[PDB]
């Protein structure tokens, strides 16, 4: 490139770097410098003039990128320029411009706006590699602060909604979907109209990935303790279909959008997980083969085949005996109060056992 | 995608910088040296480091580069793996004399990575910070620069991580190499008592008014994850098997007392 | 005080030294009886501070032939230029299996101890002995044996010297029991690591469960010990 | 004649009497010795001696090729000789087959890069032959050899493998793992590639037999399909059953023998049960085979040591179950409770904020001591240099002093 | 390894191929005798190795799999239990062997106990050299 350990005059040195592109860059450099050295007015040429016909302006751009952040209103300056990158439709040298700033340095993150602008630009400019770097940083930043002013948060929720379906990996899509559901299910977009549209999407998201169990994710934290059951959502209908365990319950309760595509295969996958858990959970815990054939409504060897991928899922998890003691342990699935009451029983057990064994090991250390 | 973006470090590399700084050879303020390792794609693996004769002053830099080559040969005979990755320096970050530190590195021609080691009495100051130069001039004057930030994380050898865990317990207070199983059992009982206190608070938060929402099917899966592993299952057949194994382990332990006593009977006959 | 026999003093070993040994591990030649290197230190308060170490890198594969003098000479030139001088107070080994004394290393210790009284030989025994109490052992040799050095021979020398009686199960020097006052930097690291780096601490602990379920460790160590006990006892 | 000709050849190389590698004098002599040994080895000879002379010839040639720079056509001939070697090693030593085949695929890959080779169909059959043949290494049944110390056989296997140029013999899981990371996996034939997908990742044990049997018969049909591949099918078929049996032993506790036979279609019922019995006899899985109503039990947790492990670690991906082993109960009890507390617990965060305050209280005092310790340590460092060095003179001076004194009292 | 049909094949085929079966008109008588000895001692090695895991054994499977009559199988098993003095309960009427001799640790314990016994034997040998 050329050096920036020339005697600053940094604005003038960067102006002198405009007069090394197309002719139009030079005229408003030198004829700008005949009026003022300026700040924003001098910088406007880098935003308005193009990176010629391919993006090898990156090294002079890095010098320009720091220069605009400190003297005035950084966020307004940095939410400019970026849409030129998206229009260009090359990603690597544009990503290098975004990567140099990143966040948490050089005039800072905000408060979130500078971080939002680089992240928003990166989603528009560049695919999975840039986004996957951003998400763990965003997650551990969220547990240090999250916005008082909702519109900053709503800008982020909208980016996460665009991003999760643009992550072309099903389980990174599931992970990004869960982060979007946790934030919406926590605070902001409540604003119940915004919540309704993503609540209807959450029912579709649960049916979309057969890894999403049935109602378990909604039950687990705030979402079921935040969204109405019957009012508009149709939310408890899925919870009723899950309990009453049958093709007939889905056939009664299903709806045009999901059965058109449609939900035929997924009902059998749902039936396999729910009944195998429910029998073992109630009986209580070592179910006969003969019962399991009647419950699943399939052959003996078909029950064993269902047991293999129940074991691969790890919804049940020990060695399988021939006719009795068929599927045991794990118990990973939801059970509401029948897991809360189990925890209260376990606390009583833990408190007796840990104190008593600590007393024995405190006579033997 | 651009190259190096995450840097993997480990406590031996940090320990080598601290040792070089403290033993002492007047190195009380600005101490500079060379870091070594290998790379994969967007990752840098830093596996060792060593200091060189140096100066940094307004405006001077000295690096004994000819020592650095001999140090590299000795290091390359010690480790066929290790390659030079960059330079480390004690803070403050981004002194202008870094341009001269880049020029000394420039002679030998690989990419540089820069590690700043902090010393501040501030918990929120990060201890070691990583940067790579960008713009990056060269044929105008020398090597003017701006810095792109890199993220430092832990991951080399597990025995080093288990050993640093033990060293971190020694940092709290010794902690010493004969108690280990008992020390672990006390850490586990100390942790189990925190769980009893935590679950008592988590339930009582629900009883008092409303609580436990983040601790609902989440904690109910953690407690099940514990219970499924230990004690595994529950029936009479399995505890009978466990007690039979305790008797065999006791029998092996008893036979080991008998072997040691027979070695003692041989020892006592041949030392009279 | 920390004084032992002759003029010797108890060993104080840095945790920085332990990390430097762990970097040069026990791999790139797992089965191979390589004596790893020298220990450097100085006479301090009540004790010997072992401040440093460096490895001696020989012609290692399964084979492991000895190596050039100028590696030690250039390393001890280089080490002095960064910090203090080549004050060499012992040597260290891991290396293969659980704690064993291959016989010519006793002669090597005897030759070293005749040259330097104030010296400790360090044996490191971690996962390969099942990690595992007494995982670092620091041993010195007997003065009466050193006093009559050289030599031992086959039956002359030995018949005269061993019937003056020399001790040979001997002083093991206890290591950590107080602060070095270098903990400070590691302590500032500790509160952060923990912190938002919790993923690393949890993963490091979780490696143990994978190791403990997978490895047949009690049977495995008993089989190598049974093999070792039968080899040496049948030879004796 | 081959043994004495090799003694003459090595003696001629050791003369250097107006002779060197630059005129390629070694190359027709080595080419003859390779062709003569290779034909005698195929037609009939005693196993040991042909290999003993051939390995010594290979060590010289590897030296000469490294010294003279690596020559492409003699290395290509060495690749052709190595294909004869892999077949002989599948008969005599699976570890040597694994190192030679990996070397053959490496050297032939470098020859394709260096010289260009457009023989696409032949490359496809040779890659499928390589992936299917390579991991098939049984365990050691030589009981007298174990007693008389296996380590000497291992010493020769390690040195012969270093002589071959691939260090120590490759182990079963790592050999699969790095072969998968090689971009030759991309080039593998569809039926064989999806056979790999069935054998490695979609390893459903009640559907493996449905998938494999058709592909196993197809690779056993001989007109164009490499004669080596057809003789590797029964060992591949047995290795498939062995991998399946260890997975079944980790998923089933007990099974009827009638149902067990139904799940594994095979050439004969007697050979099938005899194969299950043979693995049970050797102990490549924990089983009790027979009972009065003829039912088989793998059991839980029972002998979760060498006999379940087979013998040092499973031959498949991580669906082995949670069986109890040394320290595991204590480690899982501590780790689960630690994970539950460390991940989100406010009382632990509160403890840490108090601990961080205590660390800062120590550190804020420590900087005052670091300033004082600098003056103490600089004073110590300078005078430690001089005091220890002055003594390090004496511990040498006294040796000369002892002789000088002992030369004054005689 | 213990495959008896494989053991027969290596001994019989390669001694026809080498001109060594031909020599005596009793060739098939000797082959039949060697075949039966290989069947008996393969069954013997099978029981010795797999008594390391066998709880119990059916005797039909032993008869069919080693291609032998029940009198020969009863004769093989009874002599093995009777003259190595094994703690195994044989039922000839119900054709069933029950034993439960397992184990991996018990083998290491026996090997250590043999090694310790050779310590006491040498300890008392040194005394009989001394006196």
mmCIF file of C-alpha atoms in Angstrom, chain B residues 26-166:
data_model
loop_
_atom_site.group_PDB
_atom_site.id
_atom_site.type_symbol
_atom_site.label_atom_id
_atom_site.label_comp_id
_atom_site.label_asym_id
_atom_site.label_seq_id
_atom_site.Cartn_x
_atom_site.Cartn_y
_atom_site.Cartn_z
ATOM 1 C CA UNK B 26 15.872 -5.875 34.819
ATOM 2 C CA UNK B 27 12.602 -6.826 32.961
ATOM 3 C CA UNK B 28 10.233 -4.899 35.216
ATOM 4 C CA UNK B 29 8.310 -2.832 32.629
ATOM 5 C CA UNK B 30 8.510 -3.484 28.858
ATOM 6 C CA UNK B 31 9.490 -7.096 28.044
ATOM 7 C CA UNK B 32 9.241 -8.360 24.445
ATOM 8 C CA UNK B 33 9.581 -11.897 22.995
ATOM 9 C CA UNK B 34 8.648 -14.438 20.300
ATOM 10 C CA UNK B 35 5.691 -16.895 20.234
ATOM 11 C CA UNK B 36 5.675 -20.239 18.407
ATOM 12 C CA UNK B 37 3.200 -22.954 17.362
ATOM 13 C CA UNK B 38 1.183 -23.836 14.224
ATOM 14 C CA UNK B 39 -2.064 -22.846 12.381
ATOM 15 C CA UNK B 40 -5.264 -24.333 10.920
ATOM 16 C CA UNK B 41 -7.324 -22.165 8.474
ATOM 17 C CA UNK B 42 -8.880 -19.487 10.766
ATOM 18 C CA UNK B 43 -7.239 -20.802 13.957
ATOM 19 C CA UNK B 44 -3.784 -20.173 15.385
ATOM 20 C CA UNK B 45 -2.337 -22.725 17.833
ATOM 21 C CA UNK B 46 0.227 -21.122 20.192
ATOM 22 C CA UNK B 47 2.118 -23.934 21.939
ATOM 23 C CA UNK B 48 5.275 -22.203 23.262
ATOM 24 C CA UNK B 49 7.090 -18.842 23.532
ATOM 25 C CA UNK B 50 10.520 -17.431 24.481
ATOM 26 C CA UNK B 51 12.091 -13.960 25.054
ATOM 27 C CA UNK B 52 15.017 -12.401 23.135
ATOM 28 C CA UNK B 53 17.461 -9.503 24.018
ATOM 29 C CA UNK B 54 15.466 -6.283 23.454
ATOM 30 C CA UNK B 55 15.074 -2.522 23.877
ATOM 31 C CA UNK B 56 12.016 -0.289 23.349
ATOM 32 C CA UNK B 57 12.419 3.447 24.000
ATOM 33 C CA UNK B 58 11.324 6.816 22.499
ATOM 34 C CA UNK B 59 12.242 6.222 19.628
ATOM 35 C CA UNK B 60 14.267 2.997 19.570
ATOM 36 C CA UNK B 61 13.635 -0.703 19.229
ATOM 37 C CA UNK B 62 16.275 -3.403 19.505
ATOM 38 C CA UNK B 63 15.683 -7.072 18.701
ATOM 39 C CA UNK B 64 18.615 -9.514 18.667
ATOM 40 C CA UNK B 65 17.477 -11.226 15.469
ATOM 41 C CA UNK B 66 20.600 -13.316 15.070
ATOM 42 C CA UNK B 67 19.969 -14.716 18.629
ATOM 43 C CA UNK B 68 16.343 -15.302 17.516
ATOM 44 C CA UNK B 69 17.524 -17.532 14.602
ATOM 45 C CA UNK B 70 19.779 -19.624 16.928
ATOM 46 C CA UNK B 71 16.919 -19.811 19.486
ATOM 47 C CA UNK B 72 14.641 -21.008 16.647
ATOM 48 C CA UNK B 73 17.149 -23.774 15.634
ATOM 49 C CA UNK B 74 17.428 -24.986 19.270
ATOM 50 C CA UNK B 75 13.607 -24.839 19.549
ATOM 51 C CA UNK B 76 13.199 -26.706 16.210
ATOM 52 C CA UNK B 77 15.567 -29.457 17.420
ATOM 53 C CA UNK B 78 13.501 -29.626 20.685
ATOM 54 C CA UNK B 79 10.181 -29.651 18.806
ATOM 55 C CA UNK B 80 9.883 -30.627 15.099
ATOM 56 C CA UNK B 81 6.334 -29.193 15.221
ATOM 57 C CA UNK B 82 6.808 -25.550 16.390
ATOM 58 C CA UNK B 83 6.973 -22.626 13.872
ATOM 59 C CA UNK B 84 7.297 -18.844 14.577
ATOM 60 C CA UNK B 85 3.871 -17.106 14.771
ATOM 61 C CA UNK B 86 4.489 -13.622 16.174
ATOM 62 C CA UNK B 87 5.728 -11.315 18.899
ATOM 63 C CA UNK B 88 4.516 -10.667 22.459
ATOM 64 C CA UNK B 89 5.008 -7.565 24.586
ATOM 65 C CA UNK B 90 3.943 -6.295 28.034
ATOM 66 C CA UNK B 91 1.526 -3.302 27.965
ATOM 67 C CA UNK B 92 0.446 -0.595 27.213
ATOM 68 C CA UNK B 93 -1.146 -1.761 23.934
ATOM 69 C CA UNK B 94 -0.287 -0.069 20.575
ATOM 70 C CA UNK B 95 2.908 1.965 21.231
ATOM 71 C CA UNK B 96 4.160 3.670 17.997
ATOM 72 C CA UNK B 97 7.576 1.887 18.297
ATOM 73 C CA UNK B 98 5.541 -1.216 17.202
ATOM 74 C CA UNK B 99 6.388 0.036 13.651
ATOM 75 C CA UNK B 100 10.067 -0.709 14.417
ATOM 76 C CA UNK B 101 9.077 -4.076 16.062
ATOM 77 C CA UNK B 102 7.275 -4.869 12.765
ATOM 78 C CA UNK B 103 10.436 -3.871 10.755
ATOM 79 C CA UNK B 104 12.652 -6.267 12.785
ATOM 80 C CA UNK B 105 10.073 -9.011 12.057
ATOM 81 C CA UNK B 106 9.800 -7.818 8.358
ATOM 82 C CA UNK B 107 13.440 -8.857 7.692
ATOM 83 C CA UNK B 108 12.599 -12.543 8.189
ATOM 84 C CA UNK B 109 9.362 -12.333 6.119
ATOM 85 C CA UNK B 110 6.398 -14.339 7.756
ATOM 86 C CA UNK B 111 3.053 -12.894 8.942
ATOM 87 C CA UNK B 112 3.126 -11.331 12.475
ATOM 88 C CA UNK B 113 0.611 -11.839 15.296
ATOM 89 C CA UNK B 114 0.861 -9.419 18.259
ATOM 90 C CA UNK B 115 0.064 -10.349 21.879
ATOM 91 C CA UNK B 116 -0.226 -7.612 24.552
ATOM 92 C CA UNK B 117 0.154 -8.792 28.170
ATOM 93 C CA UNK B 118 -1.613 -6.448 30.664
ATOM 94 C CA UNK B 119 -0.748 -5.877 34.385
ATOM 95 C CA UNK B 120 -3.611 -3.636 35.600
ATOM 96 C CA UNK B 121 -5.320 -3.792 39.036
ATOM 97 C CA UNK B 122 -8.672 -4.020 37.238
ATOM 98 C CA UNK B 123 -10.629 -7.305 36.909
ATOM 99 C CA UNK B 124 -12.330 -6.179 33.654
ATOM 100 C CA UNK B 125 -8.962 -5.564 32.001
ATOM 101 C CA UNK B 126 -8.252 -8.680 29.920
ATOM 102 C CA UNK B 127 -4.893 -10.281 30.861
ATOM 103 C CA UNK B 128 -3.702 -11.123 27.337
ATOM 104 C CA UNK B 129 -4.989 -9.390 24.180
ATOM 105 C CA UNK B 130 -4.371 -10.444 20.558
ATOM 106 C CA UNK B 131 -4.046 -8.283 17.446
ATOM 107 C CA UNK B 132 -2.929 -8.558 13.812
ATOM 108 C CA UNK B 133 -1.739 -5.540 11.780
ATOM 109 C CA UNK B 134 -3.816 -4.211 8.862
ATOM 110 C CA UNK B 135 -2.841 -1.368 6.442
ATOM 111 C CA UNK B 136 0.237 -2.197 6.327
ATOM 112 C CA UNK B 137 1.841 0.315 3.934
ATOM 113 C CA UNK B 138 5.449 -0.622 3.048
ATOM 114 C CA UNK B 139 6.940 1.138 -0.082
ATOM 115 C CA UNK B 140 6.057 4.687 1.058
ATOM 116 C CA UNK B 141 8.163 4.785 4.198
ATOM 117 C CA UNK B 142 8.413 1.532 6.247
ATOM 118 C CA UNK B 143 5.389 -0.242 7.768
ATOM 119 C CA UNK B 144 2.712 2.107 9.200
ATOM 120 C CA UNK B 145 -0.127 0.071 10.764
ATOM 121 C CA UNK B 146 -3.618 -0.213 12.272
ATOM 122 C CA UNK B 147 -4.708 -3.320 14.278
ATOM 123 C CA UNK B 148 -7.523 -5.883 13.743
ATOM 124 C CA UNK B 149 -8.552 -7.565 17.082
ATOM 125 C CA UNK B 150 -8.314 -11.377 17.474
ATOM 126 C CA UNK B 151 -10.044 -13.569 20.114
ATOM 127 C CA UNK B 152 -7.880 -15.590 22.562
ATOM 128 C CA UNK B 153 -9.252 -18.898 23.954
ATOM 129 C CA UNK B 154 -7.923 -22.016 25.772
ATOM 130 C CA UNK B 155 -7.298 -25.361 24.005
ATOM 131 C CA UNK B 156 -4.119 -27.440 23.757
ATOM 132 C CA UNK B 157 -3.316 -30.537 25.961
ATOM 133 C CA UNK B 158 -5.937 -31.945 28.489
ATOM 134 C CA UNK B 159 -3.248 -33.040 31.027
ATOM 135 C CA UNK B 160 -2.075 -29.394 31.009
ATOM 136 C CA UNK B 161 -5.697 -28.245 31.657
ATOM 137 C CA UNK B 162 -6.144 -30.833 34.489
ATOM 138 C CA UNK B 163 -2.693 -29.802 35.840
ATOM 139 C CA UNK B 164 -3.549 -26.073 35.660
ATOM 140 C CA UNK B 165 -6.847 -26.829 37.481
ATOM 141 C CA UNK B 166 -4.716 -28.350 40.295
#
